[PDB]
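> Could you send the Integrin beta-2:CYSTEINE-RICH MODULE 3 prediction when you get a chance?

Sure thing. Input:
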Amino acid sequence: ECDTINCERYNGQVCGGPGRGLCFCGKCRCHPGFEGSACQA
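Output:
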């Protein structure tokens, strides 16, 4: 909705689950200490 991009799913959720990282306007605002394919690791 904000950009020509959309939540990056790491497995079965989206962005390594919001608990670790949230997907957003063409991005994903994760917390310090996360990476993975999105924000799971």
